[PDB]
Design a binder for this molecule. Structure first.
Ligand SMILES: Nc1ncnc2c1ncn2[C@@H]1O[C@H](COP(=O)(O)OP(=O)(O)O)[C@@H](O)[C@H]1O
Ligand SMILES: Nc1ncnc2c1ncn2[C@@H]1O[C@H](COP(=O)(O)OP(=O)(O)O)[C@@H](O)[C@H]1O
Ligand SMILES: [Mg+2]
Lengths: 290, 572
């Protein structure tokens, strides 16, 4: 909307006020020929039924464009999807792709400030985040359930790191990795930020497994292994750019060995996908008969 | 109600009722013989606190004016009074239970517990030291503290036996609960060899309370710490109310919620029903002296009243706890969820103002939502709130440990064992008796039998190496008996016929050398048989028994439901 340069108008569906201002600004938005954006219309299951019927017989001008937004939610009526160009969005696979998504939210402006060890810590946080999220695609091997470790958890974890780094080195160009209270760091991040949502006693066992592996003083030692079997260890660096150049040199494909799981974890995954597919083809072939 | 309040502005007696709606614990203001000046504040349980600076409601002050003043003397008086209690306790011979109990009365339930935790914090800090004290030493300092309390506990462990007010009774019960937390924490610390001192996280993990007099403002004098989060006591009068048993799930929950408040995020405890979710958010607010308002969602929910309430939640900096949040009509779920999002984004940003439907936003406020878990690990919170809340899983409350402390405060001395037996018991009855829809073997239920056992124990009388042993054994079985007494009084009466031999059999497994006693209403039994012949009623033993369960229960609850198939003898 910015990039292109055209009157833009957003709106979050869910409120009482949300329904009306909308079936107006948008209606008008049409003849004028501007753009509109509704987001999370799925919250209005008993509403789009109307938005549909309307939009259908709502002839507009060439330049118009009504951009809606949603989450693969069964409330969306067919007609609504069928009358628009649907575009699907999925978190691509891989630890490398995971790291890049995380970094969009770690500005050099925040990461590059003293101590120099700050950046190395941010990277360890990001790598941690990638591991526990990639293991999500291996349930029930990776985790017992689907824990929604989101992006806010990372931000919160950074706020926490930042607190301890500012306590033990505020104003210095270097911090001592052994003077830092790692048990305190691991616990806040484990039991409060990322692990509050865990209701099992073994999935908590597993999260701390990774926490204790990456957030200890020895992790600051040069050539710290991340994935030994493949020779991959933490890069030496003190700036976001140093860490990005390392990320960008990683293979697009990650294997379960990266996540501390056996490689055959991938076999179960590739089979379940083979079953989902065969199963799907069989459906679109049954009706075609019946 | 605001109108009614305004008009009757000077006829206070008329407003009192509405106080339970503007103050957590303040239920009624105590006036002077002329009814022209407020001398203090009363709690629902009957406790009283006379203000230090009397307030006049005649001198001039209009409605809001004088209420704004009570709100201040409430905080003012308690803060000042806390200092006086610190000074009192500061000089008291812990062993002399006399001058000690003499101190528990000079102050509000609320303060006695704080004065207790302020000390304990400070004492533990010193024991651990500045991180330069050979283990052995610190370890000695802890035994000391760890033992000292265990003493204070015994005394109190005997007091609750002696006849005393429901008011004073709940105050010791509360103190018996906090003191068990104190020693239990220290005990942990004692299993800890390599301790860094006043700073070893094995200690910073817990909630500690520090009082720094050499601070201007009385309010800002108490500061609560937990992990790295810091709070000012709100000094909202709570009355006696309730205290939970600081079970390890509780402290783990305090850590997640305090960290959330500290991160300007909301609290979202989740799990099945009956795990201590809403109750824990309530004990935390009470711990930081906040005004906590719980909103019941599984009911007709007023959206219009919510808007108005969000405004005062924001303006007073009070706590809103939505109970069973997701059990709300999808439309209202989105309504409230959209308002919470605008307030919570406001908190995160730190703005002093909120733009709801500008207003001032009190930094101390907090939103909390409880609910059952989502599908396969997923959260049930609404998308828009997901990244705005810190969830906490509360799946298995520490029943054994709750039961245990719960009994100790009731007087029982063998609470460790009794709790280890009454908890698997409930678990068994739950799954090895008919599935009648009315059996309730949840915590709340488990606590009813414990609290009754208490009353019952207040109406009963207890009876070389080899000696102590017999003697313990006797006293031991004595309390076991008291517990069975409550088992029969509040459990088997609700049970249906076929489930009585099952329970009585089970009870035998769990309490081998002890059996159910017959009811001794010798008087009533006669009178009942006196009327039974008149009414032609065949007086059967299993029948008369039921009447006595009715008369028993009726002496407890003011609301009873006689139940069973038609022509089962209820009416007669
Ligand atoms: N730590 C605790 N100490 C004492 N009692 C508790 C504790 N946790 C739960 N309970 C008891 O168990 C019951 C739990 O119910 P509650 O927390 O109100 O519902 P929910 O867990 O569904 O929100 C409460 O009535 C409370 O008395
Ligand atoms: N103790 C008794 N001995 C003999 N007969 C009884 C006795 N109690 C009740 N009955 C008879 O059994 C019937 C029980 O019905 P009742 O208990 O009064 O209704 P409900 O069980 O629906 O409350 C009555 O009609 C009464 O005549
Ligand atoms: Mg009847």
């Amino acid at each position: 909307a910015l990039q292109l340069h055209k009157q833009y108008k957003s709106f979050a569906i869910g409120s009482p006020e949300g329904f009306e201002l909308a079936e107006k600004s948008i209606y008008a938005a049409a003849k004028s020929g501007t753009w509109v954006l509704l987001k999370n219309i799925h919250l209005a299951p008993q509403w789009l039924v109307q938005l549909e019927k309307k939009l259908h017989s709502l002839s507009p001008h060439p330049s118009f464009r009504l951009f809606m937004t949603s989450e693969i939610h069964p409330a969306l009526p067919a007609n609504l999807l069928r009358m628009s160009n649907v575009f699907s969005y999925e978190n691509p696979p891989g630890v490398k792709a995971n790291l890049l998504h995380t970094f969009i939210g770690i500005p050099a402006t925040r990461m590059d400030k003293q101590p120099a060890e700050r950046s190395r810590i941010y990277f360890l946080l990001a790598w941690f985040h990638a591991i526990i999220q990639e293991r999500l695609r291996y349930i029930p091997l990776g985790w017992t359930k689907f824990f929604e470790f989101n992006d806010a958890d990372l931000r919160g974890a950074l706020d926490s790191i930042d607190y301890w780094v500012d306590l033990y080195s505020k104003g210095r160009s270097n911090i001592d990795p052994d003077k830092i209270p790692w048990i305190a760091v691991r616990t806040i991040l484990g039991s409060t930020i990322y692990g509050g949502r865990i209701d099992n006693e073994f999935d908590m066992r597993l999260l701390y497994s990774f926490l204790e592996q990456l957030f200890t003083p020895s992790a600051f030692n040069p050539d710290f292994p991340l994935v030994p079997s493949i020779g991959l260890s933490v890069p030496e660096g003190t700036t976001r750019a140093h860490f990005m150049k390392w990320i960008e040199a990683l293979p697009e494909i990650s294997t379960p060995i990266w996540l501390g799981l056996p490689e055959n974890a991938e076999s179960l995954l590739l089979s379940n996908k083979a079953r989902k597919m065969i199963n799907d083809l069989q459906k679109m072939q049954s009706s075609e008969e019946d | 109600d605001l109108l009614e309040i305004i008009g009757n502005s000077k006829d206070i007696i008329k407003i009192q009722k509405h106080f339970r709606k503007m103050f957590a614990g303040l239920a009624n203001l105590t006036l002077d013989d002329e009814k022209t000046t407020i001398i203090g504040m009363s709690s629902a349980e009957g406790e009283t606190v006379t203000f230090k600076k009397p307030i006049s409601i005649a001198n001039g002050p209009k409605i809001h004016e004088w209420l704004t003043m009570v709100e201040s003397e409430m905080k003012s008086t308690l803060a000042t009074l806390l200092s006086e209690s610190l000074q009192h306790f500061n000089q008291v011979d812990v062993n002399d239970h006399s001058k000690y109990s003499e101190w528990v009365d000079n102050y509000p339930t609320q303060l006695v517990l704080l004065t207790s935790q302020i000390v304990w914090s400070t004492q533990v800090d010193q024991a651990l030291g500045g991180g330069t004290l050979q283990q052995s030493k610190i370890q000695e300092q802890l035994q000391s503290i760890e033992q000292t309390t265990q003493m204070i506990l015994n005394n109190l462990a005997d007091s609750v036996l002696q006849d005393l007010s429901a008011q004073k009774r709940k105050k010791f019960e509360h103190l018996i609960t906090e003191l068990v937390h104190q020693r239990d924490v220290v005990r942990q610390l004692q299993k800890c060899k390599n301790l860094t001192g006043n700073k070893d996280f094995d200690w910073l993990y817990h909630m500690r309370y520090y009082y720094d007099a050499t601070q201007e403002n009385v309010l800002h004098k108490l500061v609560i710490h937990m992990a790295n989060a810091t709070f000012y006591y709100g000094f909202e009068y709570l009355g006696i109310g309730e205290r939970l048993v600081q079970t390890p799930l509780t402290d783990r929950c305090y850590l997640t919620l305090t960290q959330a408040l500290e991160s300007r995020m909301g609290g979202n405890p989740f799990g099945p029903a009956g795990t201590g979710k809403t109750e824990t958010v309530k004990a935390l607010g009470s711990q930081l002296g906040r005004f906590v308002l719980v909103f019941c969602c599984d009911e007709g929910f007023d959206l219009q009243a919510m808007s108005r309430i969000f405004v005062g939640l924001c303006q007073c900096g009070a706590w809103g706890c939505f109970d069973e949040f997701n059990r709300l009509e999808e439309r209202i779920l989105s309504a409230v969820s959209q308002q919470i999002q605008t307030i919570q984004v406001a908190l995160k940003e730190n703005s002093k103002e909120v733009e709801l439907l500008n207003i001032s936003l009190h930094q101390d406020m907090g939103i909390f939502v409880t609910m059952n878990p989502g599908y396969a690990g997923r959260s049930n919170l609404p998308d828009n709130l997901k990244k705005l809340f810190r969830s906490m899983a509360m799946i298995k409350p520490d029943r054994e440990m709750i039961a245990q402390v719960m009994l100790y405060s009731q007087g029982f001395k063998t609470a460790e064992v009794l709790a280890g037996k009454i908890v698997p018991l409930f678990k068994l009855c739950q799954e090895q008796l008919s599935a009648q829809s009315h059996y309730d073997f949840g915590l709340r239920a488990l606590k009813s039998v414990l609290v009754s056992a208490g009353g019952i124990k207040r109406k009963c009388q207890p009876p070389d190496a080899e000696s102590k042993t017999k003697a313990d054994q006797i006293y031991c079985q004595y309390e076991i008996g008291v517990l069975l007494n409550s088992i029969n009084d509040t459990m088997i009466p609700k049970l249906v016929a076929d489930d009585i031999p099952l329970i009585q059999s089970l009870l035998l497994d769990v309490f081998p050398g002890s059996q159910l006693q017959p009811i001794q209403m010798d008087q009533l039994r006669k009178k009942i048989q006196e009327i039974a012949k008149q009414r032609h009623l065949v007086t059967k033993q299993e029948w008369v028994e039921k009447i006595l369960q009715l008369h028993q229960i009726l002496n407890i609850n003011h609301g009873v439901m006689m139940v069973g198939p038609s022509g089962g003898g209820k009416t007669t």
